[PDB]
Design a protein around this ligand. Structure first.
Ligand SMILES: *[C@@H]1O[C@H](CO)[C@@H](O)[C@H](O)[C@H]1NC(C)=O
Lengths: 53, 437
């Protein structure tokens, strides 16, 4: 079962802050979590170019 | 030779464990932890799968007598109707009207891919956890495999090790979980007894042996229309397919310590929490004695640049008079700064380079050669402006040293401001001793 592979997101790290630019070709999913005790999960579908901090 | 130690449960972090028994040269142990794996207990309450509504062909008979019979299959809707005038391609059959029978029945059964496309429920409890540990010392470097339970041996070789129990079991799992094709969820389920008609688990069958397929899917029958032959049954959609469709919020993204879950025995791997105690015993003949290469004499340390906090920026120079050159051991007593070099070769010159790292700008790490020990201090002021993608290799403790070099003026100004009021107290005391008379 083959599955696509999106392009590498454009990361431009700040200080104590992470900025990323996303260039989707199709609606995909981006999630992140923290290794600390409180995970603070997140999920949100992406269909167009967008910046996330 | 029994000795105890503690290891932070951080994967990929080399650990230095020093043994300093008298009568022999002191020795150092390299500790590695590779991919811990916590495995819980499973109970397998029941199973959930799709349901097929099996309906036989309707029964027609033109006499008017009804035959209502009851069987033991689940959720029958036993009903027969009269006043039916069925139609087919050849127009219609028979002649009689107002006196006819129409028997319609249906029931439910488990799915065809029940063997493969099922979903499993499980109950969690106190969980054991296994760890893979690599041990190294002088000309010996091997991996191990221990259950790191309350008490269990390793026997890597000449020496023997026993890993102590975990302080607390902060398992990501809890009570009841669901397993379905390589992912789990912390989502509770209704009990095996009764279930809601449609939400989830509308089929609450037990083990896959297909016995007593309890169903609460609420079949309903209705009168067929006067046009032609029918079998009108109303049914809510399968909750299993709807639950798959909604899915969302996989537990693999909710691990409170980034603990990746693999489903084949259902375990959680590669996550840091707590610390692991250990005890050991070592044979006498596993190292050298004091008579071999004693070359410490005096000692002093210097630092050139100490850009810190990323991997290793603490280049340090140690010079000392030397006897016949040979091997030796070196470490640090404190944990404010940590080194990477294991037992290192010593040349006759005595100039030795060391790599260490720390967090605070004023480290007070006390270095220790296999016979000597001298205090080492540095002004590791300069940080670096990056966000590293690799792992940290030092303790998180950041604290300026009590002596220090930049915070000294705070100490002296506080002492002086205290001295003002102390001398004022002294002069008041002498005055009141004069006036008490
Ligand atoms: C132990 O041996 C492996 C080779 O399998 C090597 O990569 C590793 O660096 C060795 N350990 C040390 C402390 O050198």
């Amino acid at each position: 079962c083959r599955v696509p592979l999106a392009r590498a997101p454009g990361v431009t790290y700040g200080k104590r802050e992470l900025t990323v630019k996303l260039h989707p070709d199709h609606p995909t999913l981006l999630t992140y979590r923290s290794l600390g005790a409180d995970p603070r999960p997140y999920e949100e579908w992406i269909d167009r170019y967008v910046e996330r901090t | 030779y029994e000795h105890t130690a503690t290891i932070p449960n951080v994967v990929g972090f080399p650990y230095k464990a020093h043994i300093e028994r008298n009568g022999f040269s002191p020795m150092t142990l390299q500790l590695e932890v590779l991919g811990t794996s916590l495995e819980p207990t499973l109970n397998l309450e029941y199973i959930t799968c799709e349901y097929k509504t099996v309906v036989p062909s309707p029964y027609i008979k033109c006499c008017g007598t009804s035959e209502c019979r009851s069987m033991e299959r689940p959720d029958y809707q036993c009903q027969v109707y009269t006043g039916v005038y069925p139609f087919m391609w050849g127009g219609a059959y028979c002649f009689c009207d107002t006196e006819n029978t129409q028997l319609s029945e249906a029931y439910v059964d488990r799915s065809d891919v029940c063997k493969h496309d099922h979903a499993a429920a499980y109950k969690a409890h106190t969980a054991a956890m296994k760890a893979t540990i690599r041990i190294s010392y002088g000309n010996l470097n091997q991996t191990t495999t221990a259950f790191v339970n309350g008490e269990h041996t390793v026997t890597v070789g000449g020496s023997r090790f026993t890993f102590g129990p975990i302080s607390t079991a902060w398992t990501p799992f809890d009570n009841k979980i669901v397993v379905y094709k390589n992912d789990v969820y912390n989502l509770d389920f209704p009990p095996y007894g009764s279930g809601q008609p449609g939400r989830f688990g509308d089929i609450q069958s037990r083990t896959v042996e297909s016995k007593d397929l309890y169903a609460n899917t609420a079949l309903k029958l209705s009168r067929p229309s006067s046009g032609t032959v029918h079998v009108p049954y109303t049914q809510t959609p399968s909750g299993f397919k709807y639950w798959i469709k909604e899915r969302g919020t996989s537990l693999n993204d909710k691990a409170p310590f980034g603990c990746v879950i693999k489903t084949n025995p259902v375990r959680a791997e590669n996550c840091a929490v707590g610390n692991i105690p250990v005890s050991m015993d070592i044979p006498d003949s596993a190292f050298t004695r004091v008579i071999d290469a004693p070359a410490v004499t005096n000692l002093e340390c210097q630092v050139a640049v100490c850009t810190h906090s990323s991997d290793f920026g603490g280049i340090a120079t140690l010079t000392f008079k030397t006897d016949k050159p040979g091997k030796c051991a070196v470490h640090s007593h404190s944990n404010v700064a940590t080194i990477q070099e294991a037992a290192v070769d010593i040349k006759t010159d005595g100039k030795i380079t060391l790599h260490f790292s720390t967090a605070s700008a004023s480290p007070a790490f006390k270095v220790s050669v296999c016979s000597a020990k001298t205090t080492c201090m540095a002004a590791c002021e300069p940080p670096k402006d990056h966000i590293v993608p690799y792992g940290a290799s030092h303790n998180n403790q950041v604290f300026p040293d009590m002596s220090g070099t930049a915070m000294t003026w705070v100490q002296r100004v506080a002492g002086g401001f205290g001295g003002l009021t102390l001398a004022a107290v002294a002069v008041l005391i002498l005055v009141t001793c004069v006036t008490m008379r």
